[PDB]
Amino acid sequence: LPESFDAREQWSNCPTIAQIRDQGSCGSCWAFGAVEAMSDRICIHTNGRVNVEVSAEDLLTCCGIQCGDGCNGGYPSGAWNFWTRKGLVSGGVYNSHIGCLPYTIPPCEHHVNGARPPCTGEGDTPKCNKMCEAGYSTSYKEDKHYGYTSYSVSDSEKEIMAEIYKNGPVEGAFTVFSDFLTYKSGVYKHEAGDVMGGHAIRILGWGIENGVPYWLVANSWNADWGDNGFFKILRGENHCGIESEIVAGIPRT
Amino acid sequence: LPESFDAREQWSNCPTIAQIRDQGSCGSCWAFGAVEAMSDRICIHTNGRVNVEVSAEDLLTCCGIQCGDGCNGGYPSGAWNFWTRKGLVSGGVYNSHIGCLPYTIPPCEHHVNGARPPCTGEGDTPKCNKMCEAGYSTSYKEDKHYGYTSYSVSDSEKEIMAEIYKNGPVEGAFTVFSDFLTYKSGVYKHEAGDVMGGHAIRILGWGIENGVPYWLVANSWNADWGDNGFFKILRGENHCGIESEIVAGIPRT
Ligand SMILES: *CC(=O)[C@H](COCc1ccccc1)NC(=O)[C@H](CCCNC(N)=[NH2+])NC(=O)OCc1ccccc1
Numbered sequence: 001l002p003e004s005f006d007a008r009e010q011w012s013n014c015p016t017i018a019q020i021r022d023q024g025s026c027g028s029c030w031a032f033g034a035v036e037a038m039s040d041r042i043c044i045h046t047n048g049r050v051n052v053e054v055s056a057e058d059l060l061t062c063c064g065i066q067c068g069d070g071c072n073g074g075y076p077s078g079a080w081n082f083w084t085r086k087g088l089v090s091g092g093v094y095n096s097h098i099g100c101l102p103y104t105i106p107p108c109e110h111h112v113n114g115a116r117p118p119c120t121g122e123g124d125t126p127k128c129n130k131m132c133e134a135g136y137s138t139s140y141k142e143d144k145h146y147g148y149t150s151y152s153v154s155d156s157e158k159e160i161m162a163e164i165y166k167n168g169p170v171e172g173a174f175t176v177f178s179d180f181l182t183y184k185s186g187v188y189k190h191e192a193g194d195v196m197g198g199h200a201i202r203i204l205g206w207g208i209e210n211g212v213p214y215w216l217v218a219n220s221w222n223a224d225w226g227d228n229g230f231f232k233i234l235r236g237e238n239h240c241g242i243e244s245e246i247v248a249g250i251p252r253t
Numbered sequence: 254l255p256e257s258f259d260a261r262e263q264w265s266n267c268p269t270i271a272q273i274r275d276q277g278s279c280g281s282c283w284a285f286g287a288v289e290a291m292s293d294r295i296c297i298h299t300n301g302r303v304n305v306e307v308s309a310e311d312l313l314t315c316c317g318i319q320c321g322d323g324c325n326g327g328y329p330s331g332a333w334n335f336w337t338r339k340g341l342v343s344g345g346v347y348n349s350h351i352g353c354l355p356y357t358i359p360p361c362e363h364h365v366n367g368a369r370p371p372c373t374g375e376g377d378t379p380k381c382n383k384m385c386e387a388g389y390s391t392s393y394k395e396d397k398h399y400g401y402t403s404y405s406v407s408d409s410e411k412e413i414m415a416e417i418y419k420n421g422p423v424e425g426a427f428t429v430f431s432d433f434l435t436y437k438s439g440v441y442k443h444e445a446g447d448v449m450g451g452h453a454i455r456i457l458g459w460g461i462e463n464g465v466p467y468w469l470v471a472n473s474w475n476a477d478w479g480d481n482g483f484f485k486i487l488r489g490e491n492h493c494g495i496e497s498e499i500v501a502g503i504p505r506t
């Protein structure tokens with residue numbers, strides 16, 4: 001395996017891999033890490049022939065109990081199951097008017113200062129509409145993209161690397177301590193601070209920095225948080241659980 | 254030639270065809286009608302394989318003199334000319350963080366009573382930065398998408414219909430009178446009001462409603478104007494000059 005890897009270089013033709021989204025004032029990080037990785041993998045496994053932003057809105061609103069409780073929290077693995085069973089329609093970002101069900105919860109400032117309003121708690125989850133937005137080419141059912149398999153990847157650093165290498169970005173989850181909230185650059189190594197919660201994300205490569213091994217990770221807190229929306233976190237040590245809850249899945253293409 | 258046609262239904266796999274953008278408080282309508290139609294055509298010409306949002310940002314800031322004066326107004330055929338000579342990078346809607354160069358001018362209310370700020374028009378043109386956004390997969394030069402030809406289409410209803418039918422949506426322009434500002438639905442036919450100015454739009458279809466033949470047009474004034482951002486305008490009589498300034502082009506393989 002390569003000593004360094006970045007899915008963005010590897011499948012440069014696949015623009016979703018480089019995209020950072022914004023979950024907004026809703027606790028749907030479990031949904032974002034999934035549809036972000038599903039988008040990447042649909043493109044990767046069709047060698048580029050299909051490039052669709054899979055809709056965070058559909059997953060968040062229509063998954064229901066197997067996924068958790070919407071904007072209050074949820075379970076990554078229930079998202080990948082849902083996709084293999086009931087699939088997910090396309091959907092761009094907020095006010096993009098791209099695809100069937102663009103996300104409806106507006107961008108906000110995550111533990112930073114900027115132009116947009118500060119994020120607040122967790123707005124009620126939107127209702128499941130099985131209807132695409134006015135304008136859109138095809139019907140909601142027609143627009144569904146399905147998965148063929150979903151699986152958990154075991155806590156093995158080599159297996160997770162191989163899985164990213166072969167098949168594209170994965171979803172993961174780790175424990176957030178307060179000192180993460182103000183990450184700017186470098187390799188994050190928890191030192192101080194209280195427990196905040198569990199946070200699901202997209203892992204899209206690895207590397208070394210000044211001899212510290214890390215995972216390259218896309219957060220769902222917009223591009224002005226962290227290092228342009230991305231962060232680096234110690235790899236090889238089950239640091240904050242980052243190697244404990246990996247899940248992925250292969251598209252039906 | 255059928256008695257109706259919607260590029261949205263013919264090329265259901267090209268989601269840009271159904272997408273409404275917002276030009277914001279910038280007179281860049283000349284650029285929007287262009288890059289919307291070029292995005293469409295890249296998808297139609299590749300059969301779905303290349304599915305990018307062409308940047309209104311790259312065209313607006315970088316074209317320079319032959320397009321006109323950026324946010325002050327411009328010339329559609331210059332746009333299509335610059336596309337074939339220099340090409341144009343990908344670039345999503347505001348805050349979409351998708352593609353090389355997303356749009357940097359925020360959305361606003363175009364003569365409607367909604368929640369976003371009113372457009373104050375004005376707009377100073379941004380500078381041309383030969384550089385993608387931080388996070389993007391490829392370089393600015395490497396991201397360029399090139400036109401093979403650009404051409405005008407003559408004032409002939411049938412030719413214009415045949416051009417849309419074969420090759421996809423086109424850019425047009427027409428004289429805007431103040432009674433257009435409050436269109437909601439049905440086929441537009443000017444009746445009263447003063448002249449406001451020239452307006453460049455994307456034409457993507459045609460049909461007949463209640464005996465009246467129309468063009469189906471995408472405006473760049475967001476989805477809350479008109480009929481979900483679209484509008485129909487009397488066809489077959491050069492109405493408001495709608496059949497006089499049709500410009501299009503073919504993308505390079
Ligand atoms: C990440 C996200 O949006 C929500 C809430 O975020 C809390 C938070 C996270 C980071 C920093 C500050 C605050 N979190 C969840 O959806 C988590 C993600 C996955 C956690 N992993 C496991 N194994 N549960 N899921 C979660 O909290 O499930 C519990 C729950 C479900 C339903 C309702 C309440 C709680």
Ligand SMILES: *CC(=O)[C@H](COCc1ccccc1)NC(=O)[C@H](CCCNC(N)=[NH2+])NC(=O)OCc1ccccc1
Nearest residue numbers: 280281282283321322325326327426429449450451452
């Ligand atoms: C449409 C666009 O945003 C601007 C401003 O339009 C003003 C307006 C339109 C409708 C309703 C209210 C206000 N217009 C243009 O960019 C036009 C489009 C081209 C159509 N006709 C032309 N003339 N061939 N271009 C334009 O106005 O060129 C003139 C100009 C160029 C440079 C500087 C000033 C004016």
